[PDB]
Amino acid sequence: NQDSCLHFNGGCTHRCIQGPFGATCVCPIGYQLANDTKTCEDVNECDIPGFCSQHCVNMRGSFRCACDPEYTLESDGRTCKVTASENLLLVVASRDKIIMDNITAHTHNIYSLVQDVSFVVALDFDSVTGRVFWSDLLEGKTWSAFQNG
Amino acid sequence: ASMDGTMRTVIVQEKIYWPCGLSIDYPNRLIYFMDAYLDYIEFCDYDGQNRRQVIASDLVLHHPHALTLFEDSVFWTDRGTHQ
Amino acid sequence: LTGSNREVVISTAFHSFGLTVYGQYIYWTDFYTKKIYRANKYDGSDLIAMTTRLPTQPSGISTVVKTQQQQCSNPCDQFNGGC
Ligand SMILES: *[C@@H]1O[C@H](CO)[C@@H](O)[C@H](O)[C@H]1NC(C)=O
Ligand SMILES: *[C@@H]1O[C@H](CO)[C@@H](O)[C@H](O)[C@H]1NC(C)=O
Ligand SMILES: *[C@@H]1O[C@H](CO)[C@@H](O)[C@H](O)[C@H]1NC(C)=O
Ligand SMILES: [Ca+2]
Ligand SMILES: [Ca+2]
C-alpha cells in the first residue's frame, strides 16, 4: 500500500503507521475500521442487545448508560442493580401447593405457603397490600393471602 | 389495547403458533412472549416493530407455560419437563 | 486433540448415542425422541431434526463421501515394516 502513509497519513481518518506494506491504519478504542481499510467508524454499542441493562446512548467511540429510579447503576458502567433491600421472592403454582422460593446471593430456600389449595393455575401479587393472589380450577374461585400464608 | 378497551391493535401476527405467556420489562418497555409449538422465547417492543430471540432452536424448551423477569434474568416454567 | 481448549456446542441433546460431522454441521442421533438432529458445529446456531419420529430407537450414524481421503505413506507397506 502507500509509502505516503508518512506524508498524508495514508488518507486514513485517525492514524497511519509505516510497515512492510507501506501503510497500516488504526482507530482507537471503541472505534472500528471498514472495507476501505482507511476510515474509522464508531461501534453503536446500544445496537448490541443487552450491552447495558436499561438505557443506552451512543457516543463517538463511547457509550453512556442509565438505570431507572428503582435501580442503582454499578461501578463498571453497564450493570444495574436494585436498591430495595428485600430478597427476590419467586412463587410457582403446583396443583396442591403454592411453592415459594427466597433468593439470597444466589442461594435458595424453598417452602410451601398456603394450606388447602386444590388446583392452582394463575398467580399475581399486589405490592401495596403485600399480598399474593391465585386462582383455583377445582374450586372455581380466586383467593388472596399475605406473603406469609 | 388500552386498559379500558378503547383502543385495540395486533402487534405479533407471524411466526407464532401456541403463544402461551407474557411478561413486561418496564425500564426498556419491552414485551416478553413465549411459544410452545415453535418452542421459543422472544422479546419485542410495545408496537411489535423490534423483535429479538432469547432462546430459539434449543431443545431446552419442550412445553413452556409461564414467564417472569427480574434484573437480567428470565424465569419460566415447563410442563413437559415438569421443571 | 490434546484437550487444550474445551467448549460446549449443544447444551441439551436428549441422550445422544451416535455422532458424525460434515461441512459446517454436526449430526447426532438419540434414543429419547427417536430422531436424528443437525446443528452447526461452531455455535449450535441452527438446530433441526432431519427425520420424523422413527418407529424404533435409532442407532449409530456415519457418512458416505465421494472425495478421496487424506493420504500419506505407510511404513508397513515395505517388507511389512519389519514386523
Ligand atoms: C463491506 O463488505 C461486506 C462484505 O462484502 C459487505 O457485506 C458490507 O456491506 C460492506 N460494507 C460497506 C460499507 O461497503
Ligand atoms: C427471605 O429471606 C430473608 C433472609 O433469610 C428473610 O429475612 C425474609 O423474611 C424472607 N422472606 C420470605 C418471604 O420468606
Ligand atoms: C403476615 O404478614 C402480615 C403483613 O406484614 C402481618 O400483619 C402478619 O402479622 C404476619 N403474620 C405472621 C404470622 O407472620
Ligand atoms: Ca459508540
Ligand atoms: Ca413444544
Side-chain angles (χ1 to χ4, degrees), chain A residues 49 53-55 68 71 79-82 88 90 92 121, chain B residues 25-29 43 52 65 68-72 75 77:
Chain A
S53 187
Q54 297 195 359
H55 300 277
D68 273 10
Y71 299 77
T79 302
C80 299
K81 194 168 177 181
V82 291
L88 172 63
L90 189 75
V92 172
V121 179
Chain B
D25 180 292
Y26 296 116
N28 299 269
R29 284 184 167 79
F43 68 83
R52 295 284 184 272
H65 200 253
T68 43
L69 303 167
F70 179 72
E71 292 189 334
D72 291 319
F75 301 77
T77 67

mmCIF file of all heavy atoms in Angstrom, chain A residues 47 49 53-55 68 71 79-82 88 90 92 121, chain B residues 25-29 43 52 65 68-72 75 77, unseen atoms left out:
data_model
loop_
_atom_site.group_PDB
_atom_site.id
_atom_site.type_symbol
_atom_site.label_atom_id
_atom_site.label_comp_id
_atom_site.label_asym_id
_atom_site.label_seq_id
_atom_site.Cartn_x
_atom_site.Cartn_y
_atom_site.Cartn_z
ATOM 1 N N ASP A 47 -26.681 -0.968 19.857
ATOM 2 C CA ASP A 47 -27.281 -1.910 18.926
ATOM 3 C C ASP A 47 -27.125 -3.348 19.395
ATOM 4 O O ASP A 47 -27.885 -4.214 18.953
ATOM 5 C CB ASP A 47 -26.666 -1.746 17.535
ATOM 6 N N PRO A 49 -27.917 -6.245 21.705
ATOM 7 C CA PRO A 49 -28.970 -6.451 22.708
ATOM 8 C C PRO A 49 -28.372 -6.808 24.059
ATOM 9 O O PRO A 49 -27.593 -7.756 24.181
ATOM 10 C CB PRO A 49 -29.795 -7.604 22.129
ATOM 11 C CG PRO A 49 -28.842 -8.352 21.294
ATOM 12 C CD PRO A 49 -27.927 -7.322 20.697
ATOM 13 N N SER A 53 -28.095 -2.747 30.715
ATOM 14 C CA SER A 53 -29.365 -3.340 31.083
ATOM 15 C C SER A 53 -30.589 -2.491 30.748
ATOM 16 O O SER A 53 -31.617 -3.053 30.351
ATOM 17 C CB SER A 53 -29.348 -3.656 32.574
ATOM 18 O OG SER A 53 -30.499 -4.385 32.956
ATOM 19 N N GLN A 54 -30.555 -1.170 30.963
ATOM 20 C CA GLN A 54 -31.788 -0.388 30.876
ATOM 21 C C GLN A 54 -31.810 0.728 29.840
ATOM 22 O O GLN A 54 -32.684 0.708 28.968
ATOM 23 C CB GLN A 54 -32.082 0.160 32.272
ATOM 24 C CG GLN A 54 -32.323 -0.975 33.232
ATOM 25 C CD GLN A 54 -32.957 -0.558 34.518
ATOM 26 O OE1 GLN A 54 -33.234 0.617 34.749
ATOM 27 N NE2 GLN A 54 -33.216 -1.535 35.370
ATOM 28 N N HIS A 55 -30.901 1.696 29.890
ATOM 29 C CA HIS A 55 -30.892 2.788 28.927
ATOM 30 C C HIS A 55 -29.491 2.976 28.389
ATOM 31 O O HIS A 55 -28.526 2.917 29.151
ATOM 32 C CB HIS A 55 -31.380 4.091 29.560
ATOM 33 C CG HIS A 55 -32.771 4.015 30.104
ATOM 34 N ND1 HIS A 55 -33.889 4.182 29.317
ATOM 35 C CD2 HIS A 55 -33.224 3.796 31.360
ATOM 36 C CE1 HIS A 55 -34.972 4.064 30.064
ATOM 37 N NE2 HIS A 55 -34.595 3.831 31.308
ATOM 38 N N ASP A 68 -33.275 3.100 35.867
ATOM 39 C CA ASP A 68 -34.479 3.755 36.363
ATOM 40 C C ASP A 68 -34.366 4.035 37.863
ATOM 41 O O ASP A 68 -33.449 3.548 38.527
ATOM 42 C CB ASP A 68 -35.703 2.889 36.066
ATOM 43 C CG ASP A 68 -36.286 3.148 34.686
ATOM 44 O OD1 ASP A 68 -35.644 3.853 33.877
ATOM 45 O OD2 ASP A 68 -37.394 2.644 34.409
ATOM 46 N N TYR A 71 -33.531 1.490 40.504
ATOM 47 C CA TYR A 71 -32.255 0.819 40.336
ATOM 48 C C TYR A 71 -31.092 1.782 40.525
ATOM 49 O O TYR A 71 -31.202 2.984 40.266
ATOM 50 C CB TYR A 71 -32.162 0.210 38.943
ATOM 51 C CG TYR A 71 -33.215 -0.824 38.630
ATOM 52 C CD1 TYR A 71 -34.511 -0.446 38.309
ATOM 53 C CD2 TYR A 71 -32.903 -2.173 38.602
ATOM 54 C CE1 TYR A 71 -35.471 -1.385 38.004
ATOM 55 C CE2 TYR A 71 -33.855 -3.116 38.294
ATOM 56 C CZ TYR A 71 -35.137 -2.718 37.996
ATOM 57 O OH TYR A 71 -36.090 -3.661 37.688
ATOM 58 N N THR A 79 -23.968 -2.383 34.201
ATOM 59 C CA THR A 79 -24.895 -3.148 35.021
ATOM 60 C C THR A 79 -25.742 -2.257 35.921
ATOM 61 O O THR A 79 -25.300 -1.214 36.405
ATOM 62 C CB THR A 79 -24.125 -4.169 35.865
ATOM 63 O OG1 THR A 79 -23.382 -5.037 35.002
ATOM 64 C CG2 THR A 79 -25.068 -5.012 36.711
ATOM 65 N N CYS A 80 -26.976 -2.705 36.153
ATOM 66 C CA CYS A 80 -27.930 -2.074 37.051
ATOM 67 C C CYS A 80 -28.344 -3.093 38.101
ATOM 68 O O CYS A 80 -28.448 -4.289 37.810
ATOM 69 C CB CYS A 80 -29.174 -1.564 36.309
ATOM 70 S SG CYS A 80 -28.896 -0.293 35.038
ATOM 71 N N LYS A 81 -28.565 -2.619 39.323
ATOM 72 C CA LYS A 81 -28.923 -3.463 40.451
ATOM 73 C C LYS A 81 -30.062 -2.767 41.178
ATOM 74 O O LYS A 81 -30.340 -1.596 40.928
ATOM 75 C CB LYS A 81 -27.709 -3.701 41.357
ATOM 76 C CG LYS A 81 -27.857 -4.814 42.371
ATOM 77 C CD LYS A 81 -26.497 -5.120 42.982
ATOM 78 C CE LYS A 81 -26.564 -6.181 44.066
ATOM 79 N NZ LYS A 81 -25.215 -6.433 44.653
ATOM 80 N N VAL A 82 -30.763 -3.497 42.040
ATOM 81 C CA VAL A 82 -31.990 -2.999 42.654
ATOM 82 C C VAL A 82 -31.670 -2.434 44.027
ATOM 83 O O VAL A 82 -30.924 -3.039 44.808
ATOM 84 C CB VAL A 82 -33.070 -4.095 42.753
ATOM 85 C CG1 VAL A 82 -33.586 -4.455 41.375
ATOM 86 C CG2 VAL A 82 -32.569 -5.333 43.487
ATOM 87 N N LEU A 88 -35.314 -11.309 46.397
ATOM 88 C CA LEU A 88 -36.219 -11.791 45.371
ATOM 89 C C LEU A 88 -37.059 -12.920 45.943
ATOM 90 O O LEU A 88 -36.540 -13.826 46.618
ATOM 91 C CB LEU A 88 -35.461 -12.278 44.135
ATOM 92 C CG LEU A 88 -36.297 -12.993 43.058
ATOM 93 C CD1 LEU A 88 -37.329 -12.055 42.459
ATOM 94 C CD2 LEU A 88 -35.425 -13.583 41.970
ATOM 95 N N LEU A 90 -39.904 -15.765 44.602
ATOM 96 C CA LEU A 90 -40.361 -16.391 43.368
ATOM 97 C C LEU A 90 -41.419 -17.418 43.724
ATOM 98 O O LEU A 90 -41.168 -18.308 44.537
ATOM 99 C CB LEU A 90 -39.191 -17.048 42.634
ATOM 100 C CG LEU A 90 -39.445 -17.559 41.218
ATOM 101 C CD1 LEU A 90 -39.502 -16.400 40.245
ATOM 102 C CD2 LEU A 90 -38.368 -18.538 40.809
ATOM 103 N N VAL A 92 -44.340 -20.189 42.471
ATOM 104 C CA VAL A 92 -44.686 -21.134 41.424
ATOM 105 C C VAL A 92 -45.936 -21.869 41.876
ATOM 106 O O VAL A 92 -46.169 -22.064 43.073
ATOM 107 C CB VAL A 92 -43.527 -22.115 41.138
ATOM 108 C CG1 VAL A 92 -43.961 -23.217 40.198
ATOM 109 C CG2 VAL A 92 -42.335 -21.370 40.568
ATOM 110 N N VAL A 121 -53.708 -22.455 39.288
ATOM 111 C CA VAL A 121 -53.377 -22.263 37.880
ATOM 112 C C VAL A 121 -52.679 -20.929 37.636
ATOM 113 O O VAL A 121 -51.686 -20.865 36.906
ATOM 114 C CB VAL A 121 -54.630 -22.393 36.988
ATOM 115 C CG1 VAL A 121 -54.272 -22.155 35.535
ATOM 116 C CG2 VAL A 121 -55.259 -23.762 37.169
ATOM 117 N N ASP B 25 -41.053 -5.799 30.662
ATOM 118 C CA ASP B 25 -39.850 -5.192 31.218
ATOM 119 C C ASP B 25 -40.101 -3.693 31.157
ATOM 120 O O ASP B 25 -40.256 -3.129 30.070
ATOM 121 C CB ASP B 25 -38.603 -5.593 30.437
ATOM 122 C CG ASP B 25 -37.338 -4.967 30.989
ATOM 123 O OD1 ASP B 25 -37.183 -3.731 30.887
ATOM 124 O OD2 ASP B 25 -36.496 -5.712 31.531
ATOM 125 N N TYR B 26 -40.198 -3.067 32.316
ATOM 126 C CA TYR B 26 -40.647 -1.692 32.430
ATOM 127 C C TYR B 26 -39.564 -0.668 32.099
ATOM 128 O O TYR B 26 -39.861 0.308 31.398
ATOM 129 C CB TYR B 26 -41.208 -1.468 33.833
ATOM 130 C CG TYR B 26 -42.439 -2.301 34.103
ATOM 131 C CD1 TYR B 26 -42.428 -3.287 35.074
ATOM 132 C CD2 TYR B 26 -43.602 -2.117 33.373
ATOM 133 C CE1 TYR B 26 -43.542 -4.054 35.320
ATOM 134 C CE2 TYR B 26 -44.719 -2.882 33.613
ATOM 135 C CZ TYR B 26 -44.683 -3.851 34.587
ATOM 136 O OH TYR B 26 -45.792 -4.621 34.834
ATOM 137 N N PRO B 27 -38.312 -0.837 32.543
ATOM 138 C CA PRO B 27 -37.281 0.131 32.128
ATOM 139 C C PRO B 27 -37.124 0.229 30.622
ATOM 140 O O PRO B 27 -37.051 1.335 30.074
ATOM 141 C CB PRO B 27 -36.015 -0.409 32.799
ATOM 142 C CG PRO B 27 -36.501 -1.154 33.964
ATOM 143 C CD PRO B 27 -37.779 -1.786 33.536
ATOM 144 N N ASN B 28 -37.065 -0.910 29.937
ATOM 145 C CA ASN B 28 -36.891 -0.946 28.495
ATOM 146 C C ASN B 28 -38.201 -0.848 27.728
ATOM 147 O O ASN B 28 -38.170 -0.628 26.513
ATOM 148 C CB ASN B 28 -36.169 -2.230 28.091
ATOM 149 C CG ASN B 28 -34.790 -2.332 28.694
ATOM 150 O OD1 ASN B 28 -33.805 -1.895 28.099
ATOM 151 N ND2 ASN B 28 -34.708 -2.913 29.881
ATOM 152 N N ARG B 29 -39.340 -1.023 28.397
ATOM 153 C CA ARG B 29 -40.648 -1.042 27.751
ATOM 154 C C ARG B 29 -40.671 -2.085 26.638
ATOM 155 O O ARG B 29 -40.881 -1.792 25.460
ATOM 156 C CB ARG B 29 -41.029 0.345 27.235
ATOM 157 C CG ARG B 29 -41.466 1.272 28.342
ATOM 158 C CD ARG B 29 -41.942 2.603 27.824
ATOM 159 N NE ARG B 29 -42.624 3.354 28.870
ATOM 160 C CZ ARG B 29 -42.016 4.037 29.830
ATOM 161 N NH1 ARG B 29 -40.697 4.134 29.885
ATOM 162 N NH2 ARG B 29 -42.749 4.648 30.754
ATOM 163 N N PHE B 43 -38.511 -11.371 22.688
ATOM 164 C CA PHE B 43 -38.939 -10.089 23.215
ATOM 165 C C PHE B 43 -39.083 -9.122 22.054
ATOM 166 O O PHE B 43 -38.307 -9.145 21.098
ATOM 167 C CB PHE B 43 -37.995 -9.532 24.314
ATOM 168 C CG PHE B 43 -36.626 -9.118 23.843
ATOM 169 C CD1 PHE B 43 -36.414 -7.876 23.274
ATOM 170 C CD2 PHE B 43 -35.538 -9.948 24.030
ATOM 171 C CE1 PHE B 43 -35.160 -7.490 22.865
ATOM 172 C CE2 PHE B 43 -34.279 -9.561 23.625
ATOM 173 C CZ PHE B 43 -34.090 -8.329 23.048
ATOM 174 N N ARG B 52 -36.696 -9.811 18.818
ATOM 175 C CA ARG B 52 -35.439 -10.491 19.076
ATOM 176 C C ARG B 52 -35.742 -11.803 19.780
ATOM 177 O O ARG B 52 -36.793 -11.965 20.405
ATOM 178 C CB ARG B 52 -34.498 -9.654 19.945
ATOM 179 C CG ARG B 52 -34.002 -8.352 19.338
ATOM 180 C CD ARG B 52 -32.933 -8.575 18.295
ATOM 181 N NE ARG B 52 -32.402 -7.309 17.799
ATOM 182 C CZ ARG B 52 -32.906 -6.616 16.786
ATOM 183 N NH1 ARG B 52 -33.985 -7.019 16.132
ATOM 184 N NH2 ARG B 52 -32.316 -5.481 16.422
ATOM 185 N N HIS B 65 -44.928 -22.681 29.679
ATOM 186 C CA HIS B 65 -46.235 -22.118 30.009
ATOM 187 C C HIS B 65 -46.176 -20.663 30.449
ATOM 188 O O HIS B 65 -46.905 -19.835 29.893
ATOM 189 C CB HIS B 65 -46.926 -22.955 31.086
ATOM 190 C CG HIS B 65 -48.405 -22.744 31.140
ATOM 191 N ND1 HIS B 65 -49.018 -22.035 32.149
ATOM 192 C CD2 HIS B 65 -49.394 -23.132 30.300
ATOM 193 C CE1 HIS B 65 -50.321 -22.004 31.936
ATOM 194 N NE2 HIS B 65 -50.575 -22.662 30.819
ATOM 195 N N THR B 68 -41.567 -14.911 33.748
ATOM 196 C CA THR B 68 -41.340 -13.800 34.661
ATOM 197 C C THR B 68 -39.942 -13.249 34.416
ATOM 198 O O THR B 68 -39.083 -13.925 33.846
ATOM 199 C CB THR B 68 -41.479 -14.209 36.129
ATOM 200 O OG1 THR B 68 -40.829 -15.466 36.349
ATOM 201 C CG2 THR B 68 -42.930 -14.312 36.532
ATOM 202 N N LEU B 69 -39.721 -12.010 34.850
ATOM 203 C CA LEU B 69 -38.453 -11.322 34.661
ATOM 204 C C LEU B 69 -37.973 -10.682 35.955
ATOM 205 O O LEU B 69 -38.771 -10.188 36.756
ATOM 206 C CB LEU B 69 -38.566 -10.241 33.587
ATOM 207 C CG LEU B 69 -39.035 -10.700 32.213
ATOM 208 C CD1 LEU B 69 -39.401 -9.504 31.367
ATOM 209 C CD2 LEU B 69 -37.965 -11.525 31.532
ATOM 210 N N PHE B 70 -36.654 -10.671 36.136
ATOM 211 C CA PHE B 70 -36.027 -9.975 37.257
ATOM 212 C C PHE B 70 -34.596 -9.644 36.868
ATOM 213 O O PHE B 70 -33.835 -10.545 36.502
ATOM 214 C CB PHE B 70 -36.046 -10.818 38.526
ATOM 215 C CG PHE B 70 -35.396 -10.149 39.700
ATOM 216 C CD1 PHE B 70 -36.008 -9.081 40.327
ATOM 217 C CD2 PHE B 70 -34.166 -10.573 40.164
ATOM 218 C CE1 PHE B 70 -35.413 -8.459 41.402
ATOM 219 C CE2 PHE B 70 -33.570 -9.955 41.242
ATOM 220 C CZ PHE B 70 -34.193 -8.895 41.858
ATOM 221 N N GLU B 71 -34.238 -8.363 36.946
ATOM 222 C CA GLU B 71 -32.918 -7.846 36.556
ATOM 223 C C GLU B 71 -32.613 -8.361 35.149
ATOM 224 O O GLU B 71 -33.473 -8.241 34.265
ATOM 225 C CB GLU B 71 -31.904 -8.219 37.630
ATOM 226 C CG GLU B 71 -32.103 -7.502 38.952
ATOM 227 C CD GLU B 71 -30.952 -7.725 39.912
ATOM 228 O OE1 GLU B 71 -30.270 -8.764 39.792
ATOM 229 O OE2 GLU B 71 -30.729 -6.862 40.787
ATOM 230 N N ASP B 72 -31.437 -8.945 34.899
ATOM 231 C CA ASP B 72 -31.086 -9.507 33.602
ATOM 232 C C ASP B 72 -31.384 -10.996 33.525
ATOM 233 O O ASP B 72 -30.726 -11.722 32.768
ATOM 234 C CB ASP B 72 -29.610 -9.240 33.303
ATOM 235 C CG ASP B 72 -29.320 -7.776 33.059
ATOM 236 O OD1 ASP B 72 -30.128 -7.113 32.376
ATOM 237 O OD2 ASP B 72 -28.282 -7.286 33.551
ATOM 238 N N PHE B 75 -37.208 -16.106 34.052
ATOM 239 C CA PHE B 75 -37.607 -17.356 34.672
ATOM 240 C C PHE B 75 -38.836 -17.866 33.946
ATOM 241 O O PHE B 75 -39.705 -17.079 33.562
ATOM 242 C CB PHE B 75 -37.935 -17.181 36.156
ATOM 243 C CG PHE B 75 -36.806 -16.647 36.984
ATOM 244 C CD1 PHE B 75 -36.473 -15.307 36.946
ATOM 245 C CD2 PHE B 75 -36.092 -17.481 37.821
ATOM 246 C CE1 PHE B 75 -35.445 -14.816 37.711
ATOM 247 C CE2 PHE B 75 -35.064 -16.991 38.590
ATOM 248 C CZ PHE B 75 -34.741 -15.657 38.534
ATOM 249 N N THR B 77 -41.551 -21.624 33.344
ATOM 250 C CA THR B 77 -41.976 -22.952 33.755
ATOM 251 C C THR B 77 -42.313 -23.797 32.540
ATOM 252 O O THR B 77 -42.849 -23.291 31.550
ATOM 253 C CB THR B 77 -43.193 -22.883 34.669
ATOM 254 O OG1 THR B 77 -44.323 -22.406 33.930
ATOM 255 C CG2 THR B 77 -42.933 -21.970 35.840
#
